[PDB]
Each structure stands twice: as C-alpha cells, then as structure tokens.
Amino acid sequence: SQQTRVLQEKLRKLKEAMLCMVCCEEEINSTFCPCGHTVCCESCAAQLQSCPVCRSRVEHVQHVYLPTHTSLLNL
Amino acid sequence: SQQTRVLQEKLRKLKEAMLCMVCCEEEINSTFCPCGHTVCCESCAAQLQSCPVCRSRVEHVQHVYLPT
Ligand SMILES: COc1ccc([C@H](N)c2ccccc2)cc1
Ligand SMILES: COc1ccc([C@H](N)c2ccccc2)cc1
Ligand SMILES: [Zn+2]
Ligand SMILES: [Zn+2]
Ligand SMILES: [Zn+2]
Ligand SMILES: [Zn+2]
C-alpha cells in the first residue's frame, strides 16, 4: 500500500544516517575526541586533523561498537 | 498489507537498538572508554564502574554526537 512506501522511505533514511559522511559507503564506527562528533568510518577518520563538523582539533580517534552495526567490517 | 507489518517491525527494531540497554527509555549517546561499547544514555553510563557488555573498567565516558 501507500503506507508500505512511506515506511520503506523512513527505514532507508535511518539506515543512510548510519553511513560515513565522507565515503558514504561504510558504517560510522569512529568518534573524534574530545569533541565527540561520530560521523566517519575508521578509514576516513584516520587522516583528518580537525573535525569535519565543528573544526575542533582531533586529539585522537575512539573506536565505537554500536548495537546497530551490521556490516562485515564491524562483525 | 503484510509487508506494512514487516516494515513496521523492522523500523521498530532499528529504533529499539538505538535505546539505552539499562533504562530502555533514553537514546544511546555515550561511549565507555577505553573499550568503546556505546550502549547507554548519559544517566546510566555515569552510574556504571564496569562496562555492561564486556566488564572492562570504565576509565571515563565520552559523549557521542551522532547524525541520528
Ligand atoms: C546511500 O546514501 C547515503 C549514504 C551516506 C550518507 C551519509 N549519512 C552522509 C551524511 C552527510 C553528508 C553526506 C553523506 C547519506 C546518504
Ligand atoms: C521496547 O523497548 C526497548 C528498549 C530498549 C532496548 C535495548 N536496545 C536493549 C538492549 C539489550 C538489552 C536490553 C535492552 C530494547 C527494547
Ligand atoms: Zn568513510
Ligand atoms: Zn567535532
Ligand atoms: Zn539509560
Ligand atoms: Zn565494553
């Protein structure tokens, strides 16, 4: 039904929000510290000197294990 | 249709996976450091000395700003 189409759209948008803002391909699994922005996969977070969201210096990257993780890289 | 029921269940499960595993009421927004398990809201994470997933000592809690 039309309701099925609406639900499919919501599901798609929620899944896309869990993907890396730089490569758009891998799941987010890294946090920039100390600011806390958690928007990249491990590969894209590794070379950034400053946070792509707030410009704060990246002192280090903390790996995050999230319950929503499903990709073969996070399992 | 039956697919409306299936998608509603999938969406509910994905939303529930983003809720704190201790209080079941607030969104996850905290990481236990250094282990990295990100399974609690800030209120439950502040009250745990050990990670509820792996039992590693919590050295500190890092707030996470997620796009969701
Ligand atoms: C499959 O389509 C997507 C893949 C990844 C994104 C990602 N969350 C994003 C956030 C901000 C800026 C650009 C990408 C979005 C859509
Ligand atoms: C129906 O409301 C819920 C709220 C939160 C959870 C949560 N993800 C959880 C994970 C593991 C253990 C216990 C709770 C699940 C359902
Ligand atoms: Zn990436
Ligand atoms: Zn930042
Ligand atoms: Zn909680
Ligand atoms: Zn842990």
Judge if the beta carbon of residue B17 lies within 6 A of ligand 2: yes
Query: Angle at the Cα of A72 (from B13 to A42), degrees rounded to 5?
Result: 100
Instruction: Indicate yes or no: CB of A64 within 8 angstroms of CB of B31.
Output: yes
Please report, for residues B4, B36, B37, B39, B57, the alpha-carbon distance to residue B64 in angstroms, rounded to integers and kept in the order given. Answer: 33, 11, 12, 11, 19
Is A61 exposed, middle or buried (CB count within 10 Å of its CB: 0-12, 13-18, 19+)? middle
Residue spans of beta strands (DSSP E) within B1-68: 30-33, 60-63
CATH code at A2-63: 3.30.40.10
Q: Which residues on chain A are in Cβ contact (under 8 Å) with B42?
A: none
**What is the number of CB-based contacts under 8 A between chain A and chain B?**
72
| CB-based contact A9:A30 (threshold 8 Å) | no
Resolution (A): 1.5
In terms of DSSP H, where are the helices of chain A?
2-17, 42-47
Task: Tell me the sheet residues that pair with A40.
Answer: A30
Domain ranges of chain B: 2-63
- Residues whose CB falls within 8 Å of the CB of residue B42, separated by 6 or more in sequence, listed in order: B26, B29, B30, B61, B63
Distance of alpha carbon A61 from alpha carbon A56, whole angstroms: 13
Torsion over CA of B30, B36, B37 and B41, rounded to 10 degrees? Answer: 0
Distance of alpha carbon A37 from alpha carbon A28, whole angstroms: 11
Distance of alpha carbon A28 from alpha carbon A38, whole angstroms: 7
Is A37 exposed, middle or buried (CB count within 10 Å of its CB: 0-12, 13-18, 19+)? buried
Please report, for residues A21, A34, A39, B65, the alpha-carbon distance to residue A54 in angstroms, rounded to integers and kept in the order given. Answer: 14, 11, 11, 11
Would you state the structure tokens that stand for residue A24, as one six-digit string? 């758009």
Instruction: Indicate yes or no: CB of B67 within 8 angstroms of CB of A18.
Output: yes
